[PDB]
Predict the 3D structure of the following.
Amino acid sequence: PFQQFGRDIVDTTDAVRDPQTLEILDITPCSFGGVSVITPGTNTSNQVAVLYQGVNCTEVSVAIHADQLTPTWRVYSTGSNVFQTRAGCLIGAEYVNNSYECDIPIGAGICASYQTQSQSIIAYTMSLGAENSVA
Amino acid sequence: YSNNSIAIPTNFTISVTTEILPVSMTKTSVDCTMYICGDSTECSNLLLQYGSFCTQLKRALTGIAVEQDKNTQEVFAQVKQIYKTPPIKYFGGFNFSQILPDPSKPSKRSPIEDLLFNKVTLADAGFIKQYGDCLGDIAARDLICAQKFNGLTVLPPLLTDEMIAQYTSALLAGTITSGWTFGAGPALQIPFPMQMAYRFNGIGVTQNVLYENQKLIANQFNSAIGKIQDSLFSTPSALGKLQDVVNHNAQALNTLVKQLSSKFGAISSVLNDILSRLDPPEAEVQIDRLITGRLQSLQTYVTQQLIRAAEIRASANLAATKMSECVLGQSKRVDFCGKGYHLMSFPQSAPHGVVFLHVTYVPAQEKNFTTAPAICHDGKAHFPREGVFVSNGTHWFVTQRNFYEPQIITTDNTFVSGNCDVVIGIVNNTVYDPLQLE
Amino acid sequence: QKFNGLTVLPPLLTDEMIAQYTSALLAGTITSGWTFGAGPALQIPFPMQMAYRFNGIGVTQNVLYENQKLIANQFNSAIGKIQDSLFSTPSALGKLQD
Amino acid sequence: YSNNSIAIPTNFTISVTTEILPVSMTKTSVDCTMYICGDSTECSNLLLQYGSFCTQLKRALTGIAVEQDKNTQEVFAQVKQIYKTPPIKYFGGFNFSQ
Amino acid sequence: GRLQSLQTYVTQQLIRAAEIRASANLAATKMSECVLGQSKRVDFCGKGY
Ligand SMILES: *[C@@H]1O[C@H](CO)[C@@H](O[C@@H]2O[C@H](CO)[C@@H](O)[C@H](O)[C@@H]2O)[C@H](O)[C@H]1NC(C)=O
Ligand SMILES: *[C@@H]1O[C@H](CO)[C@@H](O[C@@H]2O[C@H](CO)[C@@H](O)[C@H](O)[C@@H]2O)[C@H](O)[C@H]1NC(C)=O
Ligand SMILES: *[C@@H]1O[C@H](CO)[C@@H](O[C@@H]2O[C@H](CO)[C@@H](O)[C@H](O)[C@@H]2O)[C@H](O)[C@H]1NC(C)=O
Ligand SMILES: *[C@@H]1O[C@H](CO)[C@@H](O[C@@H]2O[C@H](CO)[C@@H](O)[C@H](O)[C@@H]2O)[C@H](O)[C@H]1NC(C)=O
Ligand SMILES: *[C@@H]1O[C@H](CO)[C@@H](O[C@@H]2O[C@H](CO)[C@@H](O)[C@H](O)[C@@H]2O)[C@H](O)[C@H]1NC(C)=O
Ligand SMILES: *[C@@H]1O[C@H](CO)[C@@H](O[C@@H]2O[C@H](CO)[C@@H](O)[C@H](O)[C@@H]2O)[C@H](O)[C@H]1NC(C)=O
């Protein structure tokens, strides 16, 4: 009953009690993360893929719908170019189940590369090598 | 020690040691503006007066992350071809299920690797997308949610835990199937008893000793593997290096967070209250003091991370060398791969590190009988081609340097070059030959 | 420095114990060759240990046993020259001094 | 260099060379309190306004000190047992008194 | 001023400690290789064989 504030180990405001209804509410960062632009050589093509690091990008999609994201630019999100990885989700690059060698490392065993479909950026799980069963 | 006394091990033991070596740490991508000025436009404008000052920090952190990825790649992706273990597992009676992957486990990791994973607790997972459950944490939010408030990100490693386990499994299958030939060229398969015989031959012990003791060697290896598994399970902390790395990174992040709450010699440590209770023209001094303090804290964190990254890169280079030498071969260098005469080493994936199972050949119960530098048969000095001139006590013998397998002194196992009057300690004895008898 | 709070802690291994460790290493390497570095210390007479080392570097044991006295004299002369060079040289320990 | 000419040494010399390597340095124990505010309660109070900085400094120095101790231990304490040279020092004509 | 000086000293001490740690690792490797055994690595432990 006497507690009004709320903190944690590193001395940051975590939860707050409602001063009007005597109820509790916890506080979370809004959408903090990091934008990394995946792109092939500009002499090859101009299409790019944007990776919003470390975010459940369904919330990124709803933020784009609300038009409240900090970056002014907006990549095309046609549904196919969304792939939720463990380092956020790639927007602008589709996912192919084929496994190739890494070209542009992303994280969590995902590498994007430019390939023919007629050119687009495709994300995939990296291939460690040609499997060779020893007799 | 004596003039003519030598001790030769009549027996031997196979001891498996464990080496803990960090290869990478958590990659961080701390942002300038979010940590320095919390969503304050004029504070960011004032920070812009410092020029490209925090771009150095961002570049350093990006280089650190790239260096961690390169360290992991160098340590684990030694072989560009993934080798799969044969469906059946009878390697001359040698247990390997403990170190080989277990297909029953969902992660396809060996029991040793799973014990190592469960014995290490990661403060910041990073590759979990913690957003979504940070607000549903019910209890007090952990370090991760608070870190996500002031410009702290933990990028996931390029190689997943399962991917590193797959690389380790490929290395293990290559080693136990093709010996060390897969570390130099094509994977030339060889039966495990033959590979063990050649590893024995590489440490100055003849090939026949393994085949004569094919059992009681596999049993010793299995017992050693089980003993080290139980030792790692019940030990207080045998993963001290990896635990220290994780704790250091997490606590450096914690100190970086805590430096925000410090006033840094100003009226307050909270930017919004400062700029609200004081008009910008007067509060600029407080803003500058806060910015200098926070920038100094970020500089200290970045420099500490750079030094720790240099140390981790040195450790990862050592781990890569250890892999390329002990794993893909048999290092003759002493104490590099375990204590004793090294035979093999088995990689085991660990959280932010690598684990080496150095299988070393160690001598055992020994007796000292007698030695002589040379044997004089007929006015000539005879020296052993391999080994020493041991003596039962009455009849001399030739035997291996590291195992007591006495042999009759013929003319083929010993070479003669001398005049019987130049060697200090030559002894009276008779040597036979398969030519004069017939 | 001490009065300004900038004190230095003494090492856990004192100089006497470090010298004892070096003496143990020397005794092991001169009475057991490399055996004490792998497992139990196996006694080996020093001429035979030198034969082991010669065979390791790739020359036969007879080249040692035929001129063991010459090798011992060369070893003694070399160690005496090492001591004399350490005496004469002012900055032979440049790395530690630096 | 010729097509069919090889040079082989008809003799040999045993030369011992000295190699010197630092193993550890002085373990410093700098403390913030005196060094920044020598006997000044107010100065210490304003030092607390800079956050957990001197805790980091003390931790780094303690890590350096234990690193020096572990460096010495790793370099020297490579043998569990302290071997002793035999009372009579005659190693086949070799001289180890130095 | 004193904080900047102390941070500079601690950073330089950390760099020197890393260098000394590398040298001590090299010394331990040399001990293990050419003291507890014979090192075939030429020009590693003394010039010559
Ligand atoms: C060498 O050492 C082995 C163990 O380190 C010995 O094996 C043992 O043999 C006993 C019987 O004597 C068994 O009861 C035991 O389970 C183990 O297998 C081995 O005998 C020994 N050999 C010699 C020649 O000493
Ligand atoms: C390799 O060693 C394994 C032990 O880690 C053996 O598995 C054992 O199987 C028995 C039942 O047969 C269990 O009771 C025991 O707990 C353990 O799981 C395995 O059989 C062995 N393989 C070979 C080929 O020897
Ligand atoms: C010298 O080395 C001999 C090895 O050929 C040992 O010979 C044995 O001697 C016993 C009698 O003690 C015989 O019964 C046996 O057949 C074998 O010939 C001999 O023991 C050994 N001498 C000593 C003193 O150990
Ligand atoms: C090894 O056996 C030789 C006999 O074949 C010994 O030679 C003898 O030498 C003595 C002089 O010392 C002569 O008087 C004798 O006729 C014989 O030639 C030789 O000494 C012996 N060596 C050892 C070390 O016992
Ligand atoms: C190999 O080199 C040795 C010294 O480097 C030579 O020893 C010398 O022997 C002479 C007497 O011949 C001594 O006067 C001198 O002090 C030194 O000890 C040795 O003779 C030589 N051998 C050959 C075959 O050249
Ligand atoms: C090993 O080498 C020592 C030299 O460092 C010898 O000591 C010498 O002893 C003589 C007296 O005999 C002194 O005059 C000289 O200054 C030096 O101290 C030592 O005798 C030698 N050992 C053997 C067994 O020869």
